[PDB]
Amino acid sequence: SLINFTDGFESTGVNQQPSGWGNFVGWQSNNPNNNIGQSVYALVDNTRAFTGNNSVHFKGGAAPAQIVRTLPAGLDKVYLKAMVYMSKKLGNEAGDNHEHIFGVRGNVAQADNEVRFGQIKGHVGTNEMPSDDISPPQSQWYSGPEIAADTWHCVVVEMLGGNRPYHQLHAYLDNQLIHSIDSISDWNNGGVNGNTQWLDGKLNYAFFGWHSFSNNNADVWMDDIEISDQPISCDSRELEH
Amino acid sequence: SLINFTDGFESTGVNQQPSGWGNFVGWQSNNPNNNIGQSVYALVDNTRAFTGNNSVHFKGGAAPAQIVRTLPAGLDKVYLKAMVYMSKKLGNEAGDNHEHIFGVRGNVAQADNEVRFGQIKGHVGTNEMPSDDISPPQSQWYSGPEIAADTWHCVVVEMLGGNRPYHQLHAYLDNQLIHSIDSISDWNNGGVNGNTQWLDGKLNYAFFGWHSFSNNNADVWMDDIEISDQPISCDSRELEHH
Ligand SMILES: [Ca+2]
Ligand SMILES: [Ca+2]
Ligand SMILES: [Mg+2]
Ligand SMILES: [Mg+2]
Ligand SMILES: [Mg+2]
Ligand SMILES: [Mg+2]
């Protein structure tokens, strides 16, 4: 209703930043050096794709490599979805700090006010900034469902904000629930400093890519991105490839 | 002489960013949220100092916390100096990736074109971006001189660029030489991609603070910072012979 967006990257040339998207590359919003000569980039690639010719290829690590899209004013909730292919797994990973593929941010220039989905402490899940809280709690770290390397996955994240008693997040892999934030006790460290409305101010930009706080370089490809304020799920082709 | 700058932080109020410096805090140049309410900052502090009442207190980690000074155009060399007090050590440290306290950068917006002195792979030394090369080589890693936690140190970094056959860096602790780069074989990964003039374009901004690529939070205090195109050293008081 406020946004119904899809992108398969098919109209953008190879080695170019996806048309219509901004970037967050090397900790800089709209880095002017997002190009195939750098070690960190977010560029269209026609050598791997889920549909059509093209995907977006993120090459990064500790230095983020992301595309970023503005979200409409007044969103209460958002759904992020993509076909995702990664060089390493997420989940069930000893030694991890945290790493993420999808998120929303409040301020374009900074990664210090955002919600980050991928894994935390080696379990699929979420990190919020600026609290630096993480979900799930410590009991579940370094275990749980895996998002395997070297295959296409259909990943969906639902973020429910606005006028409800407690903001929520649900993440899915191939339409199976793999992570939930339903109440304050789903956070490790006291629940985003006690803020029940913890998506407030976060839904200004959507971002996709690779960002590791575990010192791991990766290559990630995404295709068939969808962003909506109404629910999204994976279709027969995305499930059964 | 184009620059001969000293700062003891005595004229700035406590909890304020040092007057006349820029910042690089949480990966943003001149971050407007550099204040005592945040988890990452670079602020004047009177709870510890080497001279007078005040030092600059860096609180950071993976997220950098730094002050930044613009350097004059056309430097061929620069010396960076400070009294430094750290919550953890540099050097002789197992499992370290790299971390740094001093540096110079070419472009104010990014940490991807700079020279970084502190430790690399647990030995005191230097990391260059964008090559990501490190000095000394692998044989010396996780060993060598220590810059101990919880005491004041007088640290000097000498960077020699310009028209010489190979750019050099030397670092000194209490006037003792602890780290040198003066030949391509001092680099682990084959020498900044072959660039003999590897300080070219790097002497635009000097920075001081804490930045870990080893996921270590720290608190660092510095006092009596100096920047110059002529040599800088430590006086007997700074050496703490007592
Ligand atoms: Ca496509
Ligand atoms: Ca002082
Ligand atoms: Mg699949
Ligand atoms: Mg669809
Ligand atoms: Mg001393
Ligand atoms: Mg002096």
Author numbering:
A (entry chain B): 3 to 243
B (entry chain A): 3 to 244
Excerpt from the paper describing this PDB structure:
One of these was TERTU_3803, which contained both a CBM10 and a CBM2 domain attached to a range of distinct modules (via flexible linkers) that did not bare any sequence similarity with catalytic domains typically found within carbohydrate-active enzymes. Taken together, these sequence analyses suggested that TERTU_3803 and TERTU_2913 could have a role to play in cellulose metabolism, and furthermore that role is likely to be a redox one given the presence of cytochrome domains within their linear amino acid sequences.
In addition to our work on Ttpf08450-X173, we produced TtX122A and TtX122B, representing the X122 domains from TERTU_3803 and TERTU_2913, respectively. Three molecules of TtX122B were present in the asymmetric unit, with chain B’s electron density most readily traced allowing modelling of residues 2 to 235 without breaks in the chain. Chains A and C had some areas that displayed more disorder, so there were breaks in the model between residues 190 and 192 in chain A and residues 162 and 165 in chain C. In addition to protein and water molecules, two magnesium ions were modelled into the electron density on each protomer in TtX122A based on coordination geometry and bond lengths [Fig. S4(a)]; these ions presumably bound from the crystallization medium. Our subsequent structural analysis therefore focused on single protomers from each structure.
